[PDB]
Amino acid sequence: PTYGVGYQPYRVVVLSFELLAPATVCGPKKSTNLVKNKCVNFNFNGLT
Amino acid sequence: VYAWNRKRISNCVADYSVLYNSASFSTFKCYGVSPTKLNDLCFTNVYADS
Amino acid sequence: ALGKLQDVVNQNAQALNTLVKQLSSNFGAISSVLNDILSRLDPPEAEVQ
């Protein structure tokens, strides 16, 4: 505990993402009803 | 560190908003993705090295 | 016999195809799809891409 910040311990977590295939993990969002035959913005599985 | 642990996160809905908002993390640096925009991006696979 | 004419009708088409194909190149960016860049990275960082 008396060491300087340089030698002090640090817990490191690395989150590696694969972006492409079905999305096993997605962020929090509210799915909405789709609309056929209309010029609209869309976000399918994160594809914008 | 020489034997760093690896967890696989899948079949779940992730919420990175809590991690980004948390002030405890001393240094959070994202390469290739925006920490603010993480909330929306989907991922086909996630690895958590520790 | 119609080589010459046909060749012209080819060459222009060829160029167009190549032009469209150029849309898929990365040019050093993280992704060739502009919307993907906008979504993943914030506007400040994404500006370089």
Query: What does residue C20 show for φ and ψ, rounded to 5 degrees?
Result: -60, -40
Chain B residues with CB-CB distance to C47 below 8 A: none
| B and C: number of Cβ contacts within 8 A | 18
Question: What was the structure determination method?
Answer: cryo-EM
For residues B28-46, one letter each, b for 16 or more C-beta atoms within 10 angstroms of the residue's C-beta and e for the rest, the string is: eebeebbeebbebbbbbbb
Local structure of residue A24 (DSSP, 8 states): S
Q: Give the bridge partners for B8, in sequence order.
A: B47
Of B16, B18, B20, which is closest to residue B29 (Cα–Cα)? B20
CA separation (Å) from C28 to A14, C3, C31, C48?
24, 40, 8, 10
Resolution in A: 3.7
Only one residue has tokens 């060491």, namely A3
B46 vs C: CB within 8 A: no
The string over A31-45, giving b where at least 16 C-beta atoms fall within 10 Å of a residue's C-beta and e elsewhere, is eeeeeeeeeeeeeee
Residues of C in contact with B40 (CB under 8 A): 39
Query: Cα dihedral angle (A48, A26, B50, C40), rounded to 10 degrees?
Result: 10
